[PDB]
């Protein structure tokens, strides 16, 4: 009876790294470059950071 080899596993306690809370920090730097008031560029830098 050397059981705990089963042990009906241990498909595990699963503190695994499957996280996004770990938050998905959507730093949306919407750089609206206007000239005179007209939009010339919108450099929308989505830094899509997973903390």
């Amino acid at each position: 009876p050397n059981f705990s080899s089963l042990n009906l596993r241990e498909t595990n306690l699963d503190s695994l790294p499957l996280v996004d809370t770990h938050s998905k920090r959507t730093l949306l730097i919407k750089t609206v470059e206007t000239r005179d008031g007209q939009v010339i560029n919108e450099t929308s830098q989505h830094h899509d950071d997973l903390e």
Partner: protein
Amino acid sequence: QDLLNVKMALDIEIATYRKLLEGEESRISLPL
């Protein structure tokens, strides 16, 4: 003495019946 040759054969069959009982209850008593 010639009857005792047959009695000692039965005593070896008893010493063997021990090992058969030892082997069969061990087939009944079993792993993880």
